[PDB]
Amino acid sequence: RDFNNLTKGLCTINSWHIYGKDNAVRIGEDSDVLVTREPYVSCDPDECRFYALSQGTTIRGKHSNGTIHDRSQYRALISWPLSSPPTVYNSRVECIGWSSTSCHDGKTRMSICISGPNNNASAVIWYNRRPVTEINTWARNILRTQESECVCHNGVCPVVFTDGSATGPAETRIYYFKEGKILKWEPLAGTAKHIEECSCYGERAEITCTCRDNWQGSNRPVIRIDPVAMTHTSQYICSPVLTDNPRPNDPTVGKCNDPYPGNNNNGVKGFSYLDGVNTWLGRTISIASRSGYEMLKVPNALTDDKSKPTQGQTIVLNTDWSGYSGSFMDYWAEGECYRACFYVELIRGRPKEDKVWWTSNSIVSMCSSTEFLGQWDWPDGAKIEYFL
Amino acid sequence: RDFNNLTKGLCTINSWHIYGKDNAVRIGEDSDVLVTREPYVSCDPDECRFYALSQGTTIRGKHSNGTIHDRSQYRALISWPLSSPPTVYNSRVECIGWSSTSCHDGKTRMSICISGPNNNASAVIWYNRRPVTEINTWARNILRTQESECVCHNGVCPVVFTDGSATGPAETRIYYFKEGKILKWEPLAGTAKHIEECSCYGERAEITCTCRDNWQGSNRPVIRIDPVAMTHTSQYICSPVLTDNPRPNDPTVGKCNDPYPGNNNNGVKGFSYLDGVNTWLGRTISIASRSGYEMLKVPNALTDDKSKPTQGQTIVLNTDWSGYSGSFMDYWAEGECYRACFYVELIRGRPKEDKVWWTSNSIVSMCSSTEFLGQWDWPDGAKIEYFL
Amino acid sequence: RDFNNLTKGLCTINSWHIYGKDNAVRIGEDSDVLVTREPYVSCDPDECRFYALSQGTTIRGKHSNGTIHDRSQYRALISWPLSSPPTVYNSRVECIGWSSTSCHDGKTRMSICISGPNNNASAVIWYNRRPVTEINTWARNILRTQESECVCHNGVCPVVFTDGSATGPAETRIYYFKEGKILKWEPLAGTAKHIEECSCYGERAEITCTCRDNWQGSNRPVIRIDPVAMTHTSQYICSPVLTDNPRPNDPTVGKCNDPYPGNNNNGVKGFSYLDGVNTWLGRTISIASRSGYEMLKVPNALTDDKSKPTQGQTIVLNTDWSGYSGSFMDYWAEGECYRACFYVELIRGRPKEDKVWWTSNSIVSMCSSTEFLGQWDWPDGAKIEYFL
Amino acid sequence: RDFNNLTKGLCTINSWHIYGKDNAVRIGEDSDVLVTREPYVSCDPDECRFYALSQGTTIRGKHSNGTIHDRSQYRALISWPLSSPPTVYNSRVECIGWSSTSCHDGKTRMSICISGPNNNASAVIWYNRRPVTEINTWARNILRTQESECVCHNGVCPVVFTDGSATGPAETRIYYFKEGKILKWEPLAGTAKHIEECSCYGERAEITCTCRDNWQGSNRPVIRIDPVAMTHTSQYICSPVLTDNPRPNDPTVGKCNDPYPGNNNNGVKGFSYLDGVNTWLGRTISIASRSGYEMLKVPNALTDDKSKPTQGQTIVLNTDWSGYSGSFMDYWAEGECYRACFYVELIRGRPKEDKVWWTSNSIVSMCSSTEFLGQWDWPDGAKIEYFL
Ligand SMILES: *[C@@H]1O[C@H](CO)[C@@H](O[C@@H]2O[C@H](CO)[C@@H](O[C@@H]3O[C@H](CO[C@H]4O[C@H](CO[C@H]5O[C@H](CO)[C@@H](O)[C@H](O)[C@@H]5O[C@H]5O[C@H](CO)[C@@H](O)[C@H](O)[C@@H]5O)[C@@H](O)[C@H](O[C@H]5O[C@H](CO)[C@@H](O)[C@H](O)[C@@H]5O)[C@@H]4O)[C@@H](O)[C@H](O[C@H]4O[C@H](CO)[C@@H](O)[C@H](O)[C@@H]4O[C@H]4O[C@H](CO)[C@@H](O)[C@H](O)[C@@H]4O[C@H]4O[C@H](CO)[C@@H](O)[C@H](O)[C@@H]4O)[C@@H]3O)[C@H](O)[C@H]2NC(C)=O)[C@H](O)[C@H]1NC(C)=O
Ligand SMILES: *[C@@H]1O[C@H](CO)[C@@H](O[C@@H]2O[C@H](CO)[C@@H](O[C@@H]3O[C@H](CO[C@H]4O[C@H](CO[C@H]5O[C@H](CO)[C@@H](O)[C@H](O)[C@@H]5O[C@H]5O[C@H](CO)[C@@H](O)[C@H](O)[C@@H]5O)[C@@H](O)[C@H](O[C@H]5O[C@H](CO)[C@@H](O)[C@H](O)[C@@H]5O)[C@@H]4O)[C@@H](O)[C@H](O[C@H]4O[C@H](CO)[C@@H](O)[C@H](O)[C@@H]4O[C@H]4O[C@H](CO)[C@@H](O)[C@H](O)[C@@H]4O[C@H]4O[C@H](CO)[C@@H](O)[C@H](O)[C@@H]4O)[C@@H]3O)[C@H](O)[C@H]2NC(C)=O)[C@H](O)[C@H]1NC(C)=O
């Protein structure tokens, strides 16, 4: 095998088709499904898999009580077959910890997990299912990473980490790994003022990451990485179609180089595909809560501070719970272009459904079509009442 | 690997032997078996598997309530090892949706799933476990396909779809796929007046599909496809041995080019092998309900409007529930001829057994023998009382 | 791969060491273990597996009620990894039916299952996991076979079948299969008067089968097969160490060419290794019930009508339940000789433990050592009280 | 494949990073997890796995009652994927018995299990998943071995066994195996006075084993093996940092060539890495019970009878239960040096938690880093109250 190179551009996105769905919470009502959160999807050359952070308990298990909590010693990055649920018996542990990323370089996979207490966390970088490098916290405040796949080019796999405050300036670093070793790292540059939970995709030798400015911004920061030069830029999505959550109502003009204000110290992981007129943004439908999900075609969102939607697709109704969302692509598919894909985490349980003591999720995932397909909505589908 | 070619004829069918049986409902009374319906069987060059549409819940799970319903966001095409039950832990999701087909071309497998609301459904065509093509509804009324395997010849895999009314003229199309791409499609031609749920098999470079005329016909429509020319014909089975369900009692003379009347707006998926004097038809034993199943040797059923049985085999007694049935063959077996095989879906639960709130099925499957073997009957075997 | 040839002799048997044990009934008290009976062991070139006839239900499942019964539509030959229990999720179905054998020829595996009602049973012979040949009942009375592995030589795999009475003369046939096809079959010849449930092993181009004379004999019949000539002989084990069950107490002189009388119309499957002074016989310890199990070294048992034990090994105490026993070897092991192995089926439940409504078993298996090893006893280990 | 050679030295150990954790007791509260104890970790060239001795029951199973007991017929050496729990469905049985070791030689794996009653135990040596050699008890008193991985060099895999008293002189033997055959064995030599449960690692053609002197010593005996010459030495760790349990408080000067006294007839399996100034010792934090676990950097512990810690890392708080600990390395990793790894068995249940009737464990495992990483603590994480 050779290292994959990002040689193709994005396919034209005219709609989104269903790719995978695991129905995990429905199935886990009466089967040995692990409690998870922070899911994503990532492809190897011969298979695509679901990934997430386990909570080290099943959902009917008594240890599900307390699983609203993000960071414990009982979490691990797990992967499992596409559209199956994450069960005790089919889930492969990639590494231990409570913040992760993972990506295949064309030869093998790199997985990164961070663990530790808040003031003394460390990342372990695994390559070919063996630990290779470790990175200690630099700011002693919840060293943390993407929670979705990284992207590689000719073996170089950039990863974005943050360490420091979630409610003020933090120390974001872009590490460039190859075979699990650090080639270089850079501090964040550009005009993004705070970065968390980057969602990345690659095309024609450039990696684009759409992130969460938890501190100030209801527009999303965008990091664009050149994995050959190992350099990057940052800015915000300029569009007034604001895509964090919670957020204020949409303005008529957005901000390119600073956080669009109105909501502080909160957010949600999300994503976009930024490709000129072939630009699609995801967001929650609710401005207040992690409810609903929609895709909006917003031509030139990155650069046009008045850009508005020209097309859209509902993914999850506003009467159903959503969650984190992120990008992935199958870089090893046939054809002339890369097909944009994404997932949405469908969070069930706490805090919004507090008649149960757990928090878990299921996954829905879609990829782009060049057809203009009909739309359905894709809720989690479980009845909370059944768990009482 | 090369693409498989349909170079062989059918083996002489002198009786049927047991091939597979999953006992899913029996086993699922106390194990994590998924609720399914619309099962089938399909072979790869190195393995044969069971397939079905999951309902995204186990049968003891509380979400089994409601699973009489055909179309939800929680359904998927799954496959699993021959004669195992479809469990949470052993079932591989092929694609998401509520109407499917799947077939191996000798190189890899194509799977097709349709999802969406009734007025805005779309098919996704997967090849080599990746999405390749999508097709939007053309009639905005439950785009739907075979619910059993397709057949390929030199890479060309025809698939029959219908969109439109179930109780009047609809828009049936035969798509010819290769490597998941559309080579051509044709509207239905010939004298079949309504088509659903085609059951297909191939022999000497011709594909024969036996279908369901839900609107008018208690004889079954037959589509015969030339996958090289990519053309087809349609007619009905001429025989007065009527094989849909519900149906009127058998006449003495059938109809070749129009629906044999008496029952409207209903049916069941079924199949036949039409090979001159080596012709066998399956049907339910009951004329009124999906009860029993039998195979009848009906020489020249396709073309002889007075043909009657010369031999038969009971598969399921009329005191046991049946369901859909369909054809498959192992195109990669050794020997000089293709051995005809079929399955019967053994439906349990609603609507006929309404003391439970679910609907599920198990599978029995048989293939032909050149011996004249003794017959057994093959019920599902579960006791509904145990589920109360 | 080439066909395996029986080129080696037996290793010297100086004691028996533990090979595998599945603890199935213990584990199945709280896990999804299938109800089984009639287990055995068989090796492929790269793996050894446990085999048995499933009852198509788990042991905690309500459908376990009734599983004392031998023949139903819900049985299948299953295999699973050595020393694991036979679970819903890890068990591979080989074929459907209620009497089986299976063996690897060095290239691939042949499996045979018989199904049907008592008066109309049929065998299906699978090779390379595909059905190849079928054989209809010839006597219309429970066509039945070995219930342990067959043995192959240069592709020729003899199998012993019986059809007819269990309590008087029956029609036993030795079929010689190659690639699942019938080369030849012979009726039983020699002086054995009734044959069931043969337990076979091969060495230096000869296959030895030790069987059950259910009608009259408490000595066991022995069939010796030349798989090159495709001919056989039969006789009884001459030794007065009688090894069927139930049986009379041991005499001082046995019978070579007729059944040793005293017990009629009953028996148990069992085995022996007959190799001159390297001869070991297994038997139940109890003369009355399937209780205990022991191995006795009985030099020249086959030919010496006064032969008595010179050494022994207790396998299962007489205060624990046993069951069927049979031979297998790993024909693909390293070294200069074939190591004799056997299993014992440890039957739990009905009829001897009738406070539960099921019948199931676990497996213990041992192979020979050239050391004189210490002995343990190997009970099933489950507490029936836990199942109430 | 060629046999692995121990060509590399140890990596510099500046801290320990998380490697694996299975959360077995947490997950097994509501999933089919086997009861285990005596776990370890061992790598093949393409995978690392967890190993342990099953008790032949799940933890919620009623047969979990009594599993404080060390030796029964229902135990087996099992392996399963790294960081998964040992479940009924994912656990591979390596061999049957109640004392084990296992190691890969670069070509295939050798596994050794001992079974039998106390006065008549025997070891079976498996190679390439087949039994090859057997060894009968020589002292008729609980023949027993390492309970963690062995190490191979050019095919030669030394294993340490003991047979005899646990509370006075016993008969320890070092067997040198190749392809599962005995090349040689030696009686223990040197100044260690009692040996059990050796924990081994290899580097630059030498194997170092740190063991348990159950009889007298609260310092640990160390056996150093030359696998080319097939010779060994023994002594004790000289350091006054005493690392058995229970033990007296730490002195200022230890003992090189005799047991450091104060505690008799007890101990725990443990380990060390002895590499000059790159020397790390593990131990329980409690001097009295199997509570807590810590790593201490104790330069020249082996040879310096006043050596004290210069650095350390807490693995398990003293308010959490620990257990056995042992060494392993991935001899097939990339790079210039072998990375030291270890595990800790986190024992739950009896005798310390006697409100439940079972004894089981989970596993945490770590490997060395050349960074100075932040430390977390890694408890089992289960709530005993949930099991009542
Ligand atoms: C079967 O499945 C089919 C496929 O899925 C399905 O069809 C799909 O239907 C859905 C639902 O209708 C469609 O999705 C929507 O698409 C809208 C965009 O399309 C409309 O607008 C464009 C653009 O129109 C402007 O620009 C063009 C030129 O490019 C001009 O030509 C126009 O005149 C117009 O110009 C004015 O405005 C511009 C600036 O905005 C100026 O530049 C300009 O000078 C003028 O001022 C049109 O081109 C479209 O028409 C074409 O398509 C339609 C078919 O849809 C045809 O009938 C027609 O012939 C044309 O071909 C079309 O009119 C999205 O706007 C829309 O998303 C908004 O609404 C939803 C709620 O429905 C919100 O959730 C979403 O967030 C968007 O609204 C919010 O955000 C915006 C942006 O800030 C706010 O302005 C807005 O107020 C609202 O904010 C509020 O909610 C927010 C969210 O909660 C909150 O955050 C805010 O704070 C605030 O509270 C939606 O995505 C989809 O595209 C169809 N797809 C296809 C292929 O057709 C079909 O229905 C199904 N069938 C059945 C039977 O069910
Ligand atoms: C061990 O296992 C063995 C293997 O399984 C098992 O043997 C099998 O037994 C079963 C059960 O008996 C057999 O299955 C049946 O087979 C019947 C056909 O075979 C009979 O008929 C043929 C044909 O006979 C005509 O034609 C030949 C020439 O080809 C002439 O020679 C004849 O004289 C006769 O001619 C007249 O009729 C023709 C028109 O029909 C005219 O052309 C002609 O001029 C004359 O008018 C015979 O050849 C057969 O004989 C041979 O075999 C038998 C052995 O079976 C030997 O004894 C004998 O020597 C010969 O070798 C034989 O007589 C099927 O018809 C039958 O299926 C009908 O019945 C079942 C109920 O049993 C129905 O469920 C089924 O649907 C069929 O009936 C319905 O449908 C027809 C068609 O429309 C209706 O006419 C009929 O009224 C009925 O309709 C009703 O029910 C429907 C369903 O609910 C409903 O929809 C309707 O609306 C209506 O309500 C059945 O399949 C099987 O073949 C055996 N197999 C073998 C290899 O032997 C054995 O028993 C087992 N042992 C034990 C101990 O258990």
Ligand SMILES: *[C@@H]1O[C@H](CO)[C@@H](O[C@@H]2O[C@H](CO)[C@@H](O[C@@H]3O[C@H](CO[C@H]4O[C@H](CO[C@H]5O[C@H](CO)[C@@H](O)[C@H](O)[C@@H]5O[C@H]5O[C@H](CO)[C@@H](O)[C@H](O)[C@@H]5O)[C@@H](O)[C@H](O[C@H]5O[C@H](CO)[C@@H](O)[C@H](O)[C@@H]5O)[C@@H]4O)[C@@H](O)[C@H](O[C@H]4O[C@H](CO)[C@@H](O)[C@H](O)[C@@H]4O[C@H]4O[C@H](CO)[C@@H](O)[C@H](O)[C@@H]4O[C@H]4O[C@H](CO)[C@@H](O)[C@H](O)[C@@H]4O)[C@@H]3O)[C@H](O)[C@H]2NC(C)=O)[C@H](O)[C@H]1NC(C)=O
């Ligand atoms: C640690 O583990 C160790 C390894 O496992 C374990 O050692 C093992 O111990 C077990 C138990 O003791 C041993 O197993 C038994 O072995 C017996 C055979 O060995 C004895 O006999 C031989 C043969 O002796 C005759 O022949 C030789 C020459 O070859 C002469 O030298 C002798 O003098 C004697 O000759 C007379 O008899 C012959 C005819 O029978 C004539 O030919 C001759 O002229 C004379 O008349 C001796 O060689 C043996 O000695 C050697 O070994 C011992 C060690 O065992 C040493 O001390 C000694 O120095 C020698 O080296 C030895 O004496 C088996 O017979 C025995 O099986 C019978 O008993 C059990 C019950 O225990 C029954 O279950 C079993 O079925 C057998 O009895 C039944 O069947 C026979 C046959 O028909 C009947 O005769 C008998 O009455 C009984 O029938 C009844 O029960 C049946 C079953 O229910 C029922 O069906 C009947 O109807 C009836 O009701 C048993 O297998 C084993 O071999 C040891 N292994 C080793 C390697 O040592 C050790 O104990 C463990 N340690 C601890 C501490 O636990």
Ligand SMILES: *[C@@H]1O[C@H](CO)[C@@H](O[C@@H]2O[C@H](CO)[C@@H](O[C@@H]3O[C@H](CO[C@H]4O[C@H](CO[C@H]5O[C@H](CO)[C@@H](O)[C@H](O)[C@@H]5O[C@H]5O[C@H](CO)[C@@H](O)[C@H](O)[C@@H]5O)[C@@H](O)[C@H](O[C@H]5O[C@H](CO)[C@@H](O)[C@H](O)[C@@H]5O)[C@@H]4O)[C@@H](O)[C@H](O[C@H]4O[C@H](CO)[C@@H](O)[C@H](O)[C@@H]4O[C@H]4O[C@H](CO)[C@@H](O)[C@H](O)[C@@H]4O[C@H]4O[C@H](CO)[C@@H](O)[C@H](O)[C@@H]4O)[C@@H]3O)[C@H](O)[C@H]2NC(C)=O)[C@H](O)[C@H]1NC(C)=O
């Ligand atoms: C984020 O994560 C970080 C990384 O994990 C974490 O940092 C880590 O913190 C932990 C906890 O503090 C550190 O772990 C401890 O490390 C201690 C060793 O380090 C100290 O000592 C050395 C050595 O000092 C001597 O020698 C040097 C020269 O080599 C001289 O320079 C010194 O002056 C001193 O010399 C005297 O003593 C010598 C003999 O002992 C003589 O030779 C000499 O002449 C003098 O007499 C220092 O070098 C270290 O300083 C350096 O590092 C610190 C940072 O830690 C810096 O601040 C500093 O600038 C330097 O760079 C340092 O001072 C271990 O001793 C310690 O383990 C003992 O304590 C724990 C309890 O905490 C016990 O559980 C453990 O068992 C050890 O104590 C027992 O055993 C000893 C030995 O017998 C007994 O003496 C002792 O009494 C006690 O016994 C009792 O308990 C036993 C167990 O129950 C029982 O069995 C006995 O019977 C008895 O009851 C511990 O491991 C770790 O190393 C840090 N790591 C790093 C990289 O920094 C950081 O905190 C985290 N951040 C947050 C915010 O949480």
Ligand SMILES: *[C@@H]1O[C@H](CO)[C@@H](O[C@@H]2O[C@H](CO)[C@@H](O)[C@H](O)[C@H]2NC(C)=O)[C@H](O)[C@H]1NC(C)=O
């Ligand atoms: C099915 O028939 C096709 C058409 O003849 C065979 O296709 C040829 O395959 C050869 C061998 O791979 C190629 O080099 C030719 O170029 C192919 N020809 C065409 C016209 O496509 C194919 O091999 C046949 N399949 C099998 C299993 O034999």
Ligand SMILES: [Ca+2]
């Ligand atoms: Ca924000």
Ligand SMILES: [Ca+2]
């Ligand atoms: Ca109809």
Ligand SMILES: [Ca+2]
């Ligand atoms: Ca008998």
Ligand SMILES: [Ca+2]
């Ligand atoms: Ca000690």
